[PDB]
Design an enzyme around this catalytic site. Structure first.
Site, PDB file in Angstrom:
ATOM      1  N   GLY A  35      -3.059   0.211  25.034  1.00 20.63           N
ATOM      2  CA  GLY A  35      -1.737  -0.095  25.548  1.00 20.63           C
ATOM      3  C   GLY A  35      -1.878  -0.835  26.862  1.00 20.63           C
ATOM      4  O   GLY A  35      -2.985  -1.045  27.361  1.00 20.63           O
ATOM      5  N   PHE A  37      -0.883   0.318  29.559  1.00 26.67           N
ATOM      6  CA  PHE A  37      -1.161   1.408  30.505  1.00 26.67           C
ATOM      7  C   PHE A  37      -2.675   1.708  30.591  1.00 26.67           C
ATOM      8  O   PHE A  37      -3.183   2.175  31.611  1.00 26.67           O
ATOM      9  CB  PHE A  37      -0.424   2.665  30.029  1.00 26.67           C
ATOM     10  CG  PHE A  37      -0.891   3.137  28.679  1.00 26.67           C
ATOM     11  CD1 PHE A  37      -2.091   3.856  28.540  1.00 26.67           C
ATOM     12  CD2 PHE A  37      -0.188   2.788  27.526  1.00 26.67           C
ATOM     13  CE1 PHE A  37      -2.562   4.203  27.286  1.00 26.67           C
ATOM     14  CE2 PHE A  37      -0.661   3.142  26.253  1.00 26.67           C
ATOM     15  CZ  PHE A  37      -1.845   3.846  26.134  1.00 26.67           C
ATOM     16  N   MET A 107      -4.733  17.521  21.047  1.00 30.07           N
ATOM     17  CA  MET A 107      -5.032  16.486  20.055  1.00 30.07           C
ATOM     18  C   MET A 107      -4.003  16.544  18.922  1.00 30.07           C
ATOM     19  O   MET A 107      -3.656  17.606  18.441  1.00 30.07           O
ATOM     20  CB  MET A 107      -6.442  16.698  19.490  1.00 30.07           C
ATOM     21  CG  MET A 107      -6.899  15.647  18.481  1.00 30.07           C
ATOM     22  SD  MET A 107      -7.082  13.992  19.181  1.00 30.07           S
ATOM     23  CE  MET A 107      -7.308  13.000  17.732  1.00 30.07           C
ATOM     24  N   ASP A 154      11.961   4.960  24.325  1.00 31.05           N
ATOM     25  CA  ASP A 154      11.070   4.150  23.505  1.00 31.05           C
ATOM     26  C   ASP A 154      10.724   4.804  22.190  1.00 31.05           C
ATOM     27  O   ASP A 154       9.618   4.680  21.698  1.00 31.05           O
ATOM     28  CB  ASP A 154       9.796   3.761  24.291  1.00 31.05           C
ATOM     29  CG  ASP A 154       8.968   2.638  23.605  1.00 31.05           C
ATOM     30  OD1 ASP A 154       9.548   1.746  22.931  1.00 31.05           O
ATOM     31  OD2 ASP A 154       7.719   2.649  23.763  1.00 31.05           O
TER      32      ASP A 154
HETATM   33  C1  LIG Z   1      -1.514   6.705  20.735  1.00 26.21           C
HETATM   34  C2  LIG Z   1      -1.778   8.162  20.618  1.00 26.21           C
HETATM   35  N1  LIG Z   1      -1.348   9.102  21.751  1.00 26.21           N
HETATM   36  C3  LIG Z   1      -0.669   8.908  22.924  1.00 26.21           C
HETATM   37  C4  LIG Z   1      -0.167   7.717  23.398  1.00 26.21           C
HETATM   38  C5  LIG Z   1       0.497   7.546  24.604  1.00 26.21           C
HETATM   39  C6  LIG Z   1       0.962   6.145  24.947  1.00 26.21           C
HETATM   40  O1  LIG Z   1       0.707   8.494  25.411  1.00 26.21           O
HETATM   41  S1  LIG Z   1      -0.527  10.247  23.730  1.00 26.21           S
HETATM   42  C7  LIG Z   1      -1.240  11.078  22.721  1.00 26.21           C
HETATM   43  C8  LIG Z   1      -1.516  12.428  22.739  1.00 26.21           C
HETATM   44  C9  LIG Z   1      -2.205  13.024  21.689  1.00 26.21           C
HETATM   45  C10 LIG Z   1      -2.625  12.270  20.614  1.00 26.21           C
HETATM   46  O2  LIG Z   1      -3.316  12.847  19.559  1.00 26.21           O
HETATM   47  C11 LIG Z   1      -2.352  10.931  20.596  1.00 26.21           C
HETATM   48  C12 LIG Z   1      -1.661  10.329  21.640  1.00 26.21           C
END
Ligand SMILES: CCN1/C(=C/C(C)=O)Sc2ccc(O)cc21
Length: 343
Positions: A35, A37, A107, A154
């Protein structure tokens, strides 16, 4: 030239190396998200004996500051007793590592867009869509609690993830583009396909924009395709118009960007400005859902829980979420009480 003693690439990102272990605790497995970020890696926490997702923010003030805001919102949310809070991804902790702010999350599994891809964009059953919708409404209800008043800002398939690839429980992630009710410091917000009419029109926005996004999302979950797929803002409004008609004049009369899409005729009424589009309101949601024709592409003819009655309850709820007027668009609490959810 080298960056951050060699740890960063030229774009302020931490160079991720599989198998590397940080602070004698985390073992980086692989990259799972990219991203502006920064990145999100999968990692094993030796101390808690569990997999975690780590969000490594770019080593750059602009980004570091934006992330500190997400950390405060997440911490603010998780400190709220209710169990509605288990619809928001959980932030286990955060720390600075090699000049990168890192957010450690629990996770999770697949996001709903990957889910749509694994169906070849044909959609998931109405019954699973119902389970997702129920959780989403509860999450929105949660974000609406006064002390929070958080506008996710979003929502989209990609930001809704399955907790476990087996179960149907979901959690919303990415609060990096979020904000609480307030002054309108910025206007270009939300992912295009899910951008509410008020935002496109340049009007004041509140938590209601999340509900619009949710309605667009539920329809997509079931048909497999984005309800309104604009290539640009003008194209986007036109597609919304094909389905919902011309927005009420009272709203368009106060819309600062109204003349970007519409024109006021000498008699005071509003028309599209301009066979690219079906006439206003003719692309009925009744037909997009295939209410009386066995669902999208008729591929649901005969499935349990896909009766005309079931589909009528789903159409009504979606239409209450796609209300042009943010003042009367259905709110979380009431959506939860809708018959689409009654047993
Ligand atoms: C893209 C995946 N993703 C996040 C993305 C953002 C932008 O915060 S945050 C997050 C937390 C746990 C997970 O398993 C995947 C995950």
């Amino acid at each position: 030239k080298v960056y951050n003693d060699g740890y960063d690439d030229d774009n302020y990102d931490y160079i991720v190396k599989n198998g590397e272990k940080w602070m004698d605790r985390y073992e980086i497995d692989s990259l799972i998200g990219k991203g502006s970020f920064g990145q999100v890696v999968k990692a094993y926490d030796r101390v808690e004996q569990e997999w975690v997702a780590i969000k490594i923010i770019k080593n750059k003030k602009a980004f570091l500051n934006q992330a500190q805001i997400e950390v405060r919102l997440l911490e603010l949310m998780n400190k709220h007793d209710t169990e509605m809070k288990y619809y928001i991804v959980h932030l286990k902790r955060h720390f600075m590592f090699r000049n990168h702010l890192c957010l450690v999350f629990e996770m999770l599994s697949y996001n709903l867009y990957d889910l749509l891809r694994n169906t070849n964009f044909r959609g998931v059953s109405l019954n699973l869509t119902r389970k997702f919708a129920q959780q989403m409404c509860t999450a929105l209800l949660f974000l609406a609690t006064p002390e929070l008043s958080i506008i996710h800002c979003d929502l989209k398939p990609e930001n809704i993830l399955l907790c476990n690839p087996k179960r149907s429980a979901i959690k919303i992630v990415d609060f990096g583009s979020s904000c609480q009710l307030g002054q309108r410091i910025y206007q270009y917000i939300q992912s295009r396909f899910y951008r509410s009419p008020e935002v496109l029109l340049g009007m004041p926005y509140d938590l209601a924009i999340d509900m619009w996004s949710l309605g667009c999302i539920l329809v997509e979950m079931h048909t497999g395709e984005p309800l309104f797929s604009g290539a640009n803002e003008v194209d986007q409004m036109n597609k919304i118009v094909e389905v919902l008609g011309i927005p009420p004049a009272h709203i368009l009369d106060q819309a600062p960007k109204a003349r970007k899409f519409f024109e006021k005729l000498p008699d005071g009424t509003w028309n599209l400005k301009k066979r690219e589009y079906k006439p206003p309101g003719t692309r009925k949601l009744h037909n997009i859902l295939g209410v009386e024709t066995g669902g999208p592409g008729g591929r649901r003819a005969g499935e349990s829980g896909h009766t005309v009655a079931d589909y009528l309850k789903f159409k009504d709820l979606i239409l209450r979420m796609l209300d042009y007027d943010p003042k009367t668009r259905i709110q979380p609490y009431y959506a939860l009480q809708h018959s689409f959810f009654k047993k």
